[PDB]
Amino acid sequence: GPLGSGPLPPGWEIRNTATGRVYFVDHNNRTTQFTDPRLSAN
């Protein structure tokens, strides 16, 4: 998949759902998302 080869911003962190699927954890908003903020940003 169109992942994002690079360090996450000052709040996000990569993780996985055990099964193997990798998700993103936002420490600023306190949420999640399989998407990478690096992909969709401004």
Partner: peptide
């Protein structure tokens, strides 16, 4: 009506650690 959408729901909860 080919309503097809993947992901955008499965991502576990925030919390902090990696927990499905």
């Amino acid at each position: 009506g080919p309503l097809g959408s993947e992901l955008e729901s499965p991502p576990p909860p925030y919390s902090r650690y990696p927990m499905d």
